[PDB]
């Protein structure tokens, strides 16, 4: 797939793209407000994620820190980022189809739209002001709104046994963003797209 990653936020973000044990394309890059970065994701990538990082500082070797979404201090991510991170998630060329979603299961930092740029399916979006409205006990001082599993580390929030139900915290993310996963066993909001579609992830898609 080709992904165009566009920062429509008024602040700089450092986009990241990884499948957990490797970078996708270069794995990360700075996007000033307005900039677009086109990456090539290998067909058949299963469990890929793209997210924004904020308030980062990197040295000339690409090593440093971000306040949200830091991936082991690298500009170019090889692993997933530290919550809170709104996630654009995808698995491509899986028995002829691609599957996309947005998830708040690892919290939320930056609003996002994740849409195909080719035919055949619809996009998904979580662009509500989740950081402004975040329950006090989930607020991340470093910036963003943490998920309840990150904050409290219980079997019920982290759905460790695969049992779990919705919670007062998952329901906040679901009320602000119905079309994103709010906890691990949420009713799925995954969209099926034709195999080998292309996509655009836009940070701060609205006002």
Which domains does the chain possess? 1-207 (2.60.110.10)
Q: Cβ-count burial of 97 within 10 angstroms (0-12 exposed, 13-18 middle, 19+ buried)?
A: middle
Nearest to 104 by CA among 139, 133, 145: 145
Which residues are within 8 A (CB) of 134 and not within 5 positions of it... i.e. 6 or more apart? 108, 144, 145, 172
Partner residues linked to 199 by β-bridges: 3, 116
Partner residues linked to 144 by β-bridges: none
Identify whether 84 is preceded by a cis peptide bond (ω within 30 of 0).
yes
Which residues are within 8 A (CB) of 51 and not within 5 positions of it... i.e. 6 or more apart? 15, 16, 69, 81, 85, 86, 87, 88, 109, 110
Partner residues linked to 68 by β-bridges: 54
Nearest to 84 by CA among 126, 145, 11: 145
Write down the residue that tokens 């990082």 correspond to: 53
In this structure, are residues 73 and 182 in contact, taking their beta carbons and an 8 Å threshold?
no
What kind of experiment solved this structure? X-ray
Rg (CA), the chain: 16
Nearest-angstrom CA–CA distance, 94 and 43: 9
Nearest-angstrom CA–CA distance, 92 and 150: 28
Q: Please, what is the end-to-end C-alpha distance for the chain in angstroms?
A: 28
What are the helix (H) ranges across the chain? 130-133, 148-152, 155-158, 168-176
Nearest-angstrom CA–CA distance, 74 and 81: 10
């Amino acid at each position: 797939a080709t992904f165009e990653i566009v920062n429509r936020c008024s602040y700089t973000v450092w986009a990241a793209a990884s499948k957990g044990d490797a970078a996708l394309d270069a794995g990360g890059r700075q996007l000033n407000s307005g900039e677009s970065w086109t990456i090539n994701v290998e067909p058949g990538t299963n469990g890929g994620k793209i997210w924004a990082r904020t308030d980062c500082y990197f040295d000339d070797s690409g090593s440093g820190i971000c306040k949200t979404g830091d991936c082991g201090g690298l500009l170019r991510c090889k692993r997933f980022g530290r919550p809170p991170t709104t996630l654009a998630e995808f698995s491509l060329n899986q028995y002829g189809k691609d599957y996309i979603d947005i998830s708040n299961i690892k919290g939320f930092n930056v609003p996002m739209n994740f849409s195909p740029t080719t035919r055949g399916c619809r996009g998904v979006r979580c662009a509500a002001d989740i950081v402004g409205q975040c329950p006090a006990k989930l607020k991340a001082p470093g910036g963003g709104c943490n998920d309840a599993c990150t904050v409290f580390q219980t079997s019920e929030y982290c759905c460790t046994t695969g049992k779990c139900g919705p919670t007062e915290y998952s329901r906040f993310f679901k009320r602000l963003c119905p079309d994103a996963f709010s906890y691990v066993l949420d009713k799925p909001t995954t969209v099926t797209c034709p195999g080998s579609s292309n996509y655009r992830v836009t940070f701060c898609p609205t006002a």
